Design a protein around this ligand. Sequence first.
Ligand code: PRO
Ligand code: PRO
Ligand code: PRO
Ligand code: PRO
Ligand code: PRO
Ligand code: PRO
Lengths: 258, 258
Amino acid sequence: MELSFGARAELPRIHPVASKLLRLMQKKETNLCLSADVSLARELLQLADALGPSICMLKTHVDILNDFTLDVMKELITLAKCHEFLIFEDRKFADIGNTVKKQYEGGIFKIASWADLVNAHVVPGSGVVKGLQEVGLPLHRGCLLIAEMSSTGSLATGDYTRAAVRMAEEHSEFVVGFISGSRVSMKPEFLHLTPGVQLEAGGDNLGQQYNSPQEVIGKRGSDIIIVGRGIISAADRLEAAEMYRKAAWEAYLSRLGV
Amino acid sequence: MELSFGARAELPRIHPVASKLLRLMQKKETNLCLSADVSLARELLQLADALGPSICMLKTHVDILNDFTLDVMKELITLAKCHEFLIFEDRKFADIGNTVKKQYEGGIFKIASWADLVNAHVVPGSGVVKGLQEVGLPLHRGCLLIAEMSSTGSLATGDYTRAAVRMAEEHSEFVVGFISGSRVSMKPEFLHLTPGVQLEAGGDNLGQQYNSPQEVIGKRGSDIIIVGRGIISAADRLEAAEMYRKAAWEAYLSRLGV
Ligand code: PRO
Ligand code: PRO
Ligand code: PRO
Ligand code: PRO
Ligand code: PRO
Ligand code: PRO
């Protein structure tokens, strides 16, 4: 009784950020999140503009931008609104609740002011979510919990993954889904986003491991692929994005069936 | 066969950053790390200057500083050299290795350029350490692994804690110790630093839990207390720091014995 992305966007318990995302995924036929792993604002913005029509989401690491300013993020928002994608800051909050609220709202990045989505590790216990929520709920934001990781030796397995799912369930006013390698929740209101994705097999020399879009969307039941170097290191990043979009979208259609 | 801090500073396998720290702890009779949880550079620097003689270490969250610049960190280094304490950026790196190297070296914070110590979560697997090391080893830096957390519902327990200890052992050219609630390694070359510390019992409303200096240094076998609000929220932060220093130092002396 699997529902399409467009039908999931209407579920009773859906979070508004998840609903907006699912609707634009269905409209644009994309379940691709670009991992915009660059150090220059101009490259970030040029990628966002050119690849915007192909993506449901643009994932940032603003702490790697050599020339970050809040104005850069204003320009990114303009492109996100134009092309219809969400902005996900991959900050991996992982501190006690009292600290993460300040890291989310404040400092020089003011993440909550521009990021539709952030993510958090569950290792501190649920205070990490409660602290983020204090800022994010009033700002109508969402959060993803890291239930599994793609890297070699990941400890986000077994009972740890189960704890992440329970923590998400219990904080569904703010938590909209997971970073995971597969479907980890049976509740269709939750989004599953999967990094560690390339068309070709392999990994990197610092523990990254790859699986294909067909494997992670089609066989492992995830919703969205997060793709960095598979796109960013290609010469033509637009064509690369289209190849990843088509791969992830078809895998979704095939799983959904008749 | 427990050794004093000064003798531990001479151990064959000691890391140079750990040795420098242990020597100044012994010289100054302090095993207190100030958690300088403030949002203003002027308050950070005024605390560092006044409390510098009382502390072995100043722990930052630079991503909470509303007015961060690299010049602020230059001024902090001047105070660290004058008063003899190390600078620990509590960044809690927790990404794949290829990402954390960039977050450590680059962006607007350039953490590796000014932080003697950083810390990392072990959940991604050992690639997190390998990525940080790429930057930190050439810069003669050290790292602490988060083996336990003080917050309610922490998942850093059992086999997770054991994995952190093994990861530290296997990366001893860069990893100098742990964030933990207790002694987790029997190897005296590793430092144990413990947050969640106040003189009075209790916690906060976002999952923080407190234990006293006597409990964590004396009964749980840790080396250094990390103290935030117990000092920062007091009216006289210098006297508060002295109370925490005396508590932690005596607990250490009593454990060390004859
Ligand atoms: O692992 C494999 O064999 C296939 C080849 C392309 C990606 N997956
Ligand atoms: O494994 C490798 O090294 C290459 C790059 C990623 C996909 N295959
Ligand atoms: O046809 C239908 O109604 C469902 C949803 C799209 C594919 N199968
Ligand atoms: O928990 C207790 O009872 C004591 C009181 C001060 C701190 N520890
Ligand atoms: O538990 C409380 O709320 C106070 C503040 C920390 C120590 N006792
Ligand atoms: O007296 C000694 O030699 C040891 C080290 C200081 C305390 N006991």
